Design an enzyme around this catalytic site. Structure first.
Site, short mmCIF file in Angstrom:
data_model
loop_
_atom_site.label_atom_id
_atom_site.label_comp_id
_atom_site.label_asym_id
_atom_site.label_seq_id
_atom_site.Cartn_x
_atom_site.Cartn_y
_atom_site.Cartn_z
N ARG A 1 0.90 -1.16 0.00
CA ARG A 1 0.00 0.00 0.00
C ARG A 1 0.94 1.21 0.00
N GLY A 2 1.15 1.81 -1.17
CA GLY A 2 1.97 2.99 -1.29
C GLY A 2 1.14 4.28 -1.30
N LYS A 3 1.85 5.41 -1.42
CA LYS A 3 1.15 6.70 -1.46
C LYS A 3 0.44 6.91 -2.80
N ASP B 1 15.32 6.99 -4.43
CA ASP B 1 14.69 6.48 -3.23
C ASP B 1 15.23 5.11 -2.84
OD1 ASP B 1 12.95 6.78 -1.00
OD2 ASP B 1 11.30 5.83 -2.13
N1 LIG Z 1 7.83 -5.63 -7.95
C1 LIG Z 1 7.41 -5.70 -6.67
N2 LIG Z 1 7.52 -6.88 -6.05
C2 LIG Z 1 7.12 -6.99 -4.79
N3 LIG Z 1 6.60 -6.08 -4.01
C3 LIG Z 1 6.49 -4.92 -4.63
C4 LIG Z 1 6.86 -4.63 -5.94
N4 LIG Z 1 6.58 -3.32 -6.21
C5 LIG Z 1 6.08 -2.83 -5.10
N5 LIG Z 1 5.99 -3.76 -4.10
C6 LIG Z 1 5.47 -3.65 -2.73
O1 LIG Z 1 4.51 -2.62 -2.62
C7 LIG Z 1 4.97 -1.58 -1.77
C8 LIG Z 1 4.54 -0.25 -2.31
O2 LIG Z 1 4.99 -0.21 -3.65
P1 LIG Z 1 5.72 1.13 -4.31
O3 LIG Z 1 6.26 0.72 -5.63
O4 LIG Z 1 6.66 1.71 -3.26
O5 LIG Z 1 4.36 1.99 -4.40
P2 LIG Z 1 4.20 3.57 -4.97
O6 LIG Z 1 2.93 4.01 -4.29
O7 LIG Z 1 4.37 3.58 -6.46
N6 LIG Z 1 5.56 4.32 -4.35
P3 LIG Z 1 5.79 4.80 -2.67
O8 LIG Z 1 4.64 5.76 -2.37
O9 LIG Z 1 7.19 5.46 -2.65
O10 LIG Z 1 5.69 3.46 -1.97
C9 LIG Z 1 6.49 -1.79 -1.74
O11 LIG Z 1 7.12 -1.07 -0.76
C10 LIG Z 1 6.54 -3.31 -1.66
O12 LIG Z 1 6.16 -3.65 -0.37
#
Ligand SMILES: Nc1ncnc2c1ncn2[C@@H]1O[C@H](COP(=O)(O)OP(=O)(O)NP(=O)(O)O)[C@@H](O)[C@H]1O
Length: 304
Positions: A21-23, A130
């Site tokens: 769950r990202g931003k 990052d």
């Molecule tokens: N290729 C991947 N394989 C496994 N887990 C992943 C992958 N991409 C993302 N995740 C998981 O999902 C979380 C959130 O993804 P992320 O790519 O950071 O989301 P975002 O909203 O695009 N960026 P951020 O807001 O900086 O987290 C990660 O911190 C991991 O826990």
């Protein structure tokens, strides 16, 4: 307006469980229906199409790069209009739980694996901005390594000015805390260095501090106040009078009193020498990714 990608069919993929769950996203494990191949599905709110197009552009450049998340497809939900990035699946064993279980060998594979990703990205004109354990998928069993989350990544042009509100708290390099706008992909090397410190010293995040003045102070507890004062002079950066006075009291302990029985075996002389080089305050005096990969600390895993 539109996406710069030949969109696939949402029906080609299944969703299994939420794993992130990202931003900007909700992240799921899944499969490719015809193959059965495991994949990751990153579902984005259809907001800021320019930013999605930038992330897609960046990931396309990095296709077939080592240990970098691979973009297999982009799909649009025809009813909700949400966009999903389809990525390769990498197992994420959390290194915070592996203190005293990750050997010297695991840590060299981990850091070297990420350095390979950074060298490829940098060679192709991209800085990640990052790097941190949370964006490094580590498989303790297979030793597989993957650098993910390129949403903050930017294309790099020398002597260009960039937004310093990047990276994560406690991984921000001095160039970001002091607002040097023309910073470089060497930021990624500082962030990986902070990751290496956390693994060696069993503390993630390693650096601390409530605000940026205290964060600068805590770096100099190790690295010395003078190097920070000299850095701020050299690049014309601003430090308050109070902080300058505090910084002049700090000789710099480097890595002394950080090695106890529980981490003594991973804190090899070769590892510390790499850490000291990677956590160099002057962003223009850090090793490149290519140079760091040539460090003797990686000699015993270089074969494979
Ligand atoms: N290729 C991947 N394989 C496994 N887990 C992943 C992958 N991409 C993302 N995740 C998981 O999902 C979380 C959130 O993804 P992320 O790519 O950071 O989301 P975002 O909203 O695009 N960026 P951020 O807001 O900086 O987290 C990660 O911190 C991991 O826990």
């Amino acid at each position: 307006d539109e996406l710069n990608y030949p969109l696939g069919n949402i029906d080609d993929y299944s969703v299994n469980n939420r794993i992130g769950r990202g931003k900007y996203s909700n992240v799921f494990s899944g499969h490719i229906i015809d193959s059965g191949k495991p994949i990751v599905v990153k579902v984005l709110k259809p907001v800021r199409i320019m930013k999605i197009n930038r992330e897609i552009a960046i990931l396309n450049v990095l296709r077939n790069g080592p240990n970098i998340s691979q973009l297999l497809d982009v799909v649009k939900d025809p009813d909700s209009k949400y966009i999903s990035l389809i990525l390769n699946y990498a197992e994420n064993n959390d290194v915070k739980t592996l203190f005293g279980k990750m050997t010297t060998r695991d840590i060299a594979l981990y850091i070297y694996g990420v350095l390979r990703a950074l060298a490829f990205a940098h060679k192709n004109g991209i800085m990640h901005r990052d790097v941190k354990p949370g964006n490094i998928m580590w498989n303790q069993t297979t030793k597989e390594v993957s650098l993910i989350d390129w949403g903050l990544a930017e294309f790099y042009t020398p002597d260009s000015e960039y937004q310093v509100r990047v990276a994560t708290k406690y991984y921000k390099g001095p160039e970001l805390l002091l607002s040097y706008l023309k910073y470089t992909p060497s930021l990624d090397i500082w962030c990986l260095g902070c990751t290496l410190a956390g693994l060696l010293f069993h503390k993630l995040p390693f650096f601390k501090g409530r605000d940026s003045n205290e964060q600068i102070e805590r770096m100099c507890v190790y690295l010395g106040g003078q190097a920070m004062l000299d850095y701020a002079e050299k690049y014309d950066l601003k430090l308050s009078s109070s902080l300058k006075a505090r910084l002049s009291e700090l000789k710099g302990t480097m890595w002394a009193g950080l090695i106890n029985e529980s981490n003594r075996d991973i804190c090899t002389p070769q590892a510390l020498d790499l850490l000291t080089k990677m956590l160099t305050i002057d962003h223009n005096l850090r090793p490149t990714a290519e140079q760091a990969m040539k460090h003797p600390f990686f000699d015993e895993i270089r074969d494979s």
